[PDB]
Amino acid sequence: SNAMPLPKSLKYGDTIGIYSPSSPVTYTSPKRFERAKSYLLQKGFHILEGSLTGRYDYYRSGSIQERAKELNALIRNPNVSCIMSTIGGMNSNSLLPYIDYDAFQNNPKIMIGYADATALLLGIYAKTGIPTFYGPALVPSFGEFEPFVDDTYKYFLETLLHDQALPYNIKQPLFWSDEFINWEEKTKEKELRPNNWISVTNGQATGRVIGGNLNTIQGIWGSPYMPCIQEGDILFIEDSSKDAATIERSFSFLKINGVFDKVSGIILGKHEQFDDCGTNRKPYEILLEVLQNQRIPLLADFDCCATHPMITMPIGVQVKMDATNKTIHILEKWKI
Amino acid sequence: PLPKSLKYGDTIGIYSPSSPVTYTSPKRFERAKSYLLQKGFHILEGSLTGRYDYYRSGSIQERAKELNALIRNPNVSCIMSTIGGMNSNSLLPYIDYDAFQNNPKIMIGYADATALLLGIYAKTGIPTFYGPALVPSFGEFEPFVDDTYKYFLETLLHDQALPYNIKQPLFWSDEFINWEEKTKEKELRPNNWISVTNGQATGRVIGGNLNTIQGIWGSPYMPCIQEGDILFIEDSSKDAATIERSFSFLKINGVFDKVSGIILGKHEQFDDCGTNRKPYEILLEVLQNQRIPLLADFDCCATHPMITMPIGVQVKMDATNKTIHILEKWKI
Numbered sequence: 001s002n003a004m005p006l007p008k009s010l011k012y013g014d015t016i017g018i019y020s021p022s023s024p025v026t027y028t029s030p031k032r033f034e035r036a037k038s039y040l041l042q043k044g045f046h047i048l049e050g051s052l053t054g055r056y057d058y059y060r061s062g063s064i065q066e067r068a069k070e071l072n073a074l075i076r077n078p079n080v081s082c083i084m085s086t087i088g089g090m091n092s093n094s095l096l097p098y099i100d101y102d103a104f105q106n107n108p109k110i111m112i113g114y115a116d117a118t119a120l121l122l123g124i125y126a127k128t129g130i131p132t133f134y135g136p137a138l139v140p141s142f143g144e145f146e147p148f149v150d151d152t153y154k155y156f157l158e159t160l161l162h163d164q165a166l167p168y169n170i171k172q173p174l175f176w177s178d179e180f181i182n183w184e185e186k187t188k189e190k191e192l193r194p195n196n197w198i199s200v201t202n203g204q205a206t207g208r209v210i211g212g213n214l215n216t217i218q219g220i221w222g223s224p225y226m227p228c229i230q231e232g233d234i235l236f237i238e239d240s241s242k243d244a245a246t247i248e249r250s251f252s253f254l255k256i257n258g259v260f261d262k263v264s265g266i267i268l269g270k271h272e273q274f275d276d277c278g279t280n281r282k283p284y285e286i287l288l289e290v291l292q293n294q295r296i297p298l299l300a301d302f303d304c305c306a307t308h309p310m311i312t313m314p315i316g317v318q319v320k321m322d323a324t325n326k327t328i329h330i331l332e333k334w335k336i
Numbered sequence: 337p338l339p340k341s342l343k344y345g346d347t348i349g350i351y352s353p354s355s356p357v358t359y360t361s362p363k364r365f366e367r368a369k370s371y372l373l374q375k376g377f378h379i380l381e382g383s384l385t386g387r388y389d390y391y392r393s394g395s396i397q398e399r400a401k402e403l404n405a406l407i408r409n410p411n412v413s414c415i416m417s418t419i420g421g422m423n424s425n426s427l428l429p430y431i432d433y434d435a436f437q438n439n440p441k442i443m444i445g446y447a448d449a450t451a452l453l454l455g456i457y458a459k460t461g462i463p464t465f466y467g468p469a470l471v472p473s474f475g476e477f478e479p480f481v482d483d484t485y486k487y488f489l490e491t492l493l494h495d496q497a498l499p500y501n502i503k504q505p506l507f508w509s510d511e512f513i514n515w516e517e518k519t520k521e522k523e524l525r526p527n528n529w530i531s532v533t534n535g536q537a538t539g540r541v542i543g544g545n546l547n548t549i550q551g552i553w554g555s556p557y558m559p560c561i562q563e564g565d566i567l568f569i570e571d572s573s574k575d576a577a578t579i580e581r582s583f584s585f586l587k588i589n590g591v592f593d594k595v596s597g598i599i600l601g602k603h604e605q606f607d608d609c610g611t612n613r614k615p616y617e618i619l620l621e622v623l624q625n626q627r628i629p630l631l632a633d634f635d636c637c638a639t640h641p642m643i644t645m646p647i648g649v650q651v652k653m654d655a656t657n658k659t660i661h662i663l664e665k666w667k668i
């Protein structure tokens with residue numbers, strides 16, 4: 001494709017602006033928040049704390065307007081190179097009418113996070129055409145204790161700071177965990193589980209990658225903030241800390257919307273703490289029942305989700321997925 | 337095309353499009369059947385009755401087959417879900433919409449069954465009914481079951497002249513007791529419908545369970561919301577964070593630029609996350625002072641008793657004076 005506007009690569013010493021578009025984690029998990037800030041500051045970055053840092057409004061950090069103001073102040077700040085959510089929740093989609101998309105277009109930045117922040121990552125991409133990044137959120141990702149934080153950090157740097165020739169291979173982490181331990185304070189080492197990606201349905205696909213947190217997508221679907229899925233796209237989806245009933249509903253939502261008629265392939269994230277409801281079924285098994293007799297190449301248990309460690313994935317650029325050989329390559333530039 | 341009114345001596349077919357309640361809550365199930373049998377309706381038990389597949393009654397295919405057998409049965413005049421859950425939307429590609437259109441019947445239920453009520457209406461243009469599901473609604477103990485049943489007759493069985501006035505119950509309950517077995521009387525909560533934003537509106541009513549709508553939005557099974565429609569929405573047993581997301585989902589989809597009025601159901605067991613905010617207040621924040629007539633705490637949701645509401649027909653609402661009238665025929 002033609003060259004297009006892209007955000008500048010991260011540099012050592014850059015300022016990362018943090019915001020809380022949903023849950024008030026900087027108030028309710030202060031130890032993990034301070035540890036995450038300290039992790040990035042020790043690496044040499046600066047943190048600009050958004051205006052709702054340390055505030056509390058129960059399930060959220062502040063009103064819809066206050067949250068949009070917090071993010072906009074970062075978007076408008078020429079000194080901020082990267083805008084990172086603190087954590088998700090459920091309420092990022094409330095901000096969408098109020099975001100200064102023109103200011104973001106004027107001065108594109110690296111916009112990164114995951115989970116509920118998908119509303120914003122996809123909304124900015126839909127409105128501006130600037131790739132956004134499914135990747136670390138400050139508290140969950142950078143407040144993780146060693147060792148996994150260091151793997152997350154390495155992938156973050158490799159994708160956002162280092163020069164990469166194309167095609168850029170996204171390597172499989174060697175070890176992983178989803179254990180529900182060590183949130184504020186560490187009580188034992190997480191298990192270093194040997195990692196694998198899963199060749200659910202063989203084949204290859206090449207196309208623009210679209211997606212993120214599937215549950216969250218259902219809060220933006222049909223609006224101007226959801227990029228339209230096009231023939232040949234590769235669908236990236238993950239859910240975390242849900243159950244079999246919920247994810248069947250979301251998979252059937254995609255099916256009845258025709259999404260599976262369009263896409264060339266599917267990348268499915270690991271599903272942190274999945275509740276199978278007694279079925280013993282894996283998330284991909286439920287998805288494949290919904291697919292019925294339609295064969296689609298599918299690579300599952302991809303490490304770009306709430307499990308540790310986490311890959312940083314550009315969204316809105318061409319990718320090659322090889323479900324048979326379990327490879328993912330980025331084929332188009334995502335930063336300058 | 338309209339369905340025929342229910343009559344005493346008719347057969348109600350029951351199906352389980354999601355949770356396997358006929359297996360998991362057998363006392364309430366049996367009570368519900370017995371209530372309707374004594375009133376004078378036969379019950380035809382769908383093919384998944386008594387089956388168990390964990391969070392669901394059976395496979396996608398088996399659930400579609402269960403419902404289709406009822407659609408295709410000329411002896412059935414009313415098709416009623418047993419209960420909701422999460423997974424009715426899985427059936428939508430597989431339903432025999434043409435058989436339904438060719439021989440319309442009363443389709444009733446609530447909650448997750450919204451996917452099917454709206455899908456049937458979208459595909460066939462035949463009104464469907466937001467109203468009782470067998471086990472939650474008719475397995476309720478006295479007193480509230482009796483009022484739900486009165487409402488059910490008023491919409492489905494009685495010869496009703498237009499306009500059809502939908503009247504507020506005197507008392508309600510959302511109390512989390514007396515599911516399988518009765519232990520105490522439910523407290524009688526005095527009722528009020530709430531004039532949140534004054535005004536009047538007349539238009540086609542569209543909606544149901546809001547959480548469930550997000551599982552069918554954008555598909556051929558979601559009827560297009562049109563300028564002037566009245567939006568009927570409820571959520572049940574959720575929290576402030578969930579409903580903010582759902583209200584904002586409507587907002588960014590332009591729904592509030594189209595609709596002439598909103599009817600908001602009560603919110604059973606609402607978890608306000610410590611905020612002391614009501615559901616309507618969260619909707620008001622989302623609306624940002626856009627003046628849309630809004631009548632809240634409407635009794636067509638998971639609270640008891642329940643109104644049976646036609647969907648897809650013209651309605652007149654007065655939020656100020658707390659009235660709802662159905663203006664267009666919904667049955668023969």
Ligand SMILES: C[C@H](N)C(=O)NS(=O)(=O)OC[C@H]1O[C@@H](n2cnc3c(N)ncnc32)[C@H](O)[C@@H]1O
Binds near residue numbers: 088089114115140306
């Ligand atoms: C905070 C909000 N309810 C939430 O779950 N946000 S989130 O989905 O973005 O959280 C990301 C991940 O952080 C972790 N997490 C969030 N809050 C947690 C807590 N209080 N304790 C343990 N893990 C938590 C889980 O891995 C979760 O999937």
Ligand SMILES: C[C@H](N)C(=O)NS(=O)(=O)OC[C@H]1O[C@@H](n2cnc3c(N)ncnc32)[C@H](O)[C@@H]1O
Binds near residue numbers: 357
């Ligand atoms: C069964 C499925 N998880 C569910 O909640 N289905 S439903 O949303 O349609 O349920 C309708 C209503 O039945 C009631 N309910 C369902 N299962 C129940 C149970 N096991 N105990 C108490 N009430 C229940 C609640 O009023 C609920 O809002």
